[PDB]
Structures are given as C-alpha cells and as structure tokens.
Design a protein around this ligand. Structure first.
Ligand SMILES: CC(C)(O/N=C(\C(=O)NCB(O)O)c1csc(N)n1)C(=O)O
Length: 268
C-alpha cells in the first residue's frame, strides 16, 4: 500500500458520509505495517450486536479455566425467549450447550443465546470487565438484548469507538488473547457467520475470507466488525459503525460495504 492511498481513502470515507443522513465510524488496519484508514475513529457509536464477539471471547476465556463449561447445557423455556431467537427457539426445554450458544449468537445473531451467555458470565459488567482485561478501556456493555439497541444520540450506554473495537478485534482474532485454540474457535465461528453477506464481505475480493460480526439497531444503526484474511498476506482488521439522524431510518448495508471496499482497495 502507500501513505498516499491511505490518505486518499480517508477522503473517500468523508465523501461517502456526505451521501447519507448519518455518521460513519471506520477503522481498517493493515496488520503487515499497522497502517490505518480511519474516519471518526475516536467517536462513540452504539455497537449493537457487534458486542457478541466480545461476549463470546469472554465465554471462551472462562472456558480456558473450566474443562466442563463449553459442553454445559443451559435449559430455558419458551417464555424465556427474547425477540429474534432463530436458533434457540428450536431447542426450548433442554436448551443448548454453551458452545452451541456461542455459535448461535455469532452466526445468526441470536438474542436469547446472547442473554443466556451474559447471564452465565454474571451480567453485562462481566463483559466490560473482560474487555478491560484485554486492554480495552473504552468498550462498555450496560444492558442486555434487546434494549442495548436503542442507539439514542448522546447516550453512552452500550457504546465503543471504532479505534477501540479495531484494537480489540485485532487482539482477539489475530493475537492470542484466547490462547491459540480458543482464538481458532472464535475465528471459525465468525467465518461461518450467516448475517454479513451484504456488509464487509460485499466490499472485499472473493479470495478474502472474512471473520465478521454484524450489528443492527434503532436510528438505522448498521455495523460490521472483523478481520479479512487475504491469501498469503497479513490480515486486515475492519470496523464499520454507522448510525442515522432519524430514529426510524433504515440501516445501510450498501454504505457499510462501500466503506469496506474503500479500504480493501487502498490496502491491496
Ligand atoms: C438480527 C436482526 C433482526 O436484528 N435487528 C435488531 C436486533 O435485535 N439486533 C440484535 B443486535 O444488533 O444487538 C434490532 C434491534 S432494534 C432495531 N431497530 N433492530 C437483523 O438485523 O436482521
């Protein structure tokens, strides 16, 4: 890549933001060199379901010290389900194992699976504590699903910054904070994500494998975080947060994909 291309990419992110009635938070990191392409890197954004990556990492970290945890079954009933539970609704009664709940929350964004894992860890503050333990002094999880998606302007609950989340994704997916096996497992789950086809994945070449987690909420909030793995090249971290001025705006998959494409083309 080049410094000149990175600067030009940051200008194209400004131009992209001018095209819609909201704001764009963006960090992409080329881990070959640490080079960065950013827009609003240090502003807070409502992270919505992208926190499910941090949640799952916290569960994996606890399993490193507990050989029974990943196969532990957590029963739940139909009345326990929260809105948008495509996988967990199929397994009411005996429930699912902790590993299955991680996979469900990561790959389908299942909200009951998330709530079960937040509760297992001891509540939202345990997820914030895990983030602090991997060097993220910015991330905060305050509420559970689905209230954490309110995305009210000026509200700092359930927010992070693009820069903080890009460093955490890099540490979790590319570095070895989970230990080599846990790291591989988190990557595999996010590589098998079913909800991201129109977001970062739509902006990168077909040969780049993307481990990502999406988020969607009120105020047209549309997010995607993860790591792209070009073949035989260092990984590239992508964090894309967008949120709109109107409470009932639609999320914009095309803007997320465009922002990713700007950085993929600048780095490649
Ligand atoms: C998974 C689904 C249904 O998500 N849309 C959701 C939602 O529950 N997202 C879970 B997450 O982004 O924390 C949501 C909350 S408020 C709002 N408006 N939308 C989606 O993106 O298809």
């Amino acid at each position: 890549g080049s410094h000149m291309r990175n600067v030009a990419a940051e200008q194209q992110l400004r131009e992209l933001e001018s095209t819609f009635d909201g704001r764009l938070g963006f960090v992409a990191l080329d881990t070959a060199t640490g080079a960065r392409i950013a827009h609003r890197a240090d502003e807070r954004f409502p992270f919505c379901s992208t926190f499910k990556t941090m949640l799952s990492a916290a569960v994996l970290a606890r399993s490193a010290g507990d050989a029974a945890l990943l196969q532990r079954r957590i029963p739940y009933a139909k009345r326990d389900l929260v809105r948008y539970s495509p996988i967990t609704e199929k397994h009411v009664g005996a429930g699912m194992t902790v590993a299955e709940l991680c996979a469900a929350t990561l790959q389908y964004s299942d909200n009951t699976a998330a709530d079960l894992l937040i509760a297992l860890l001891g509540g939202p503050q345990a997820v914030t504590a895990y983030a602090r333990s991997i060097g993220d002094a910015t991330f905060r999880l305050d509420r559970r699903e689905t209230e954490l998606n309110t995305a009210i302007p000026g509200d700092e609950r359930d927010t992070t910054t693009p820069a903080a989340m890009a460093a955490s994704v890099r540490r979790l997916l590319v570095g070895d904070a989970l230990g080599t096996a846990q790291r591989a497992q988190l990557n595999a789950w996010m590589l098998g994500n079913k909800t991201g086809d129109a977001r970062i994945r739509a902006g990168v070449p077909a040969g780049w494998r993307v481990a990502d987690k999406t988020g969607t909420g009120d105020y047209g909030t549309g997010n995607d975080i993860g790591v792209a793995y070009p073949p035989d090249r260092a990984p590239i971290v992508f964090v894309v947060y967008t949120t709109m001025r109107s409470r009932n705006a639609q999320a914009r998959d095309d803007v997320i994909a465009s922002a990713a494409r700007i950085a993929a083309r600048a780095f490649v």
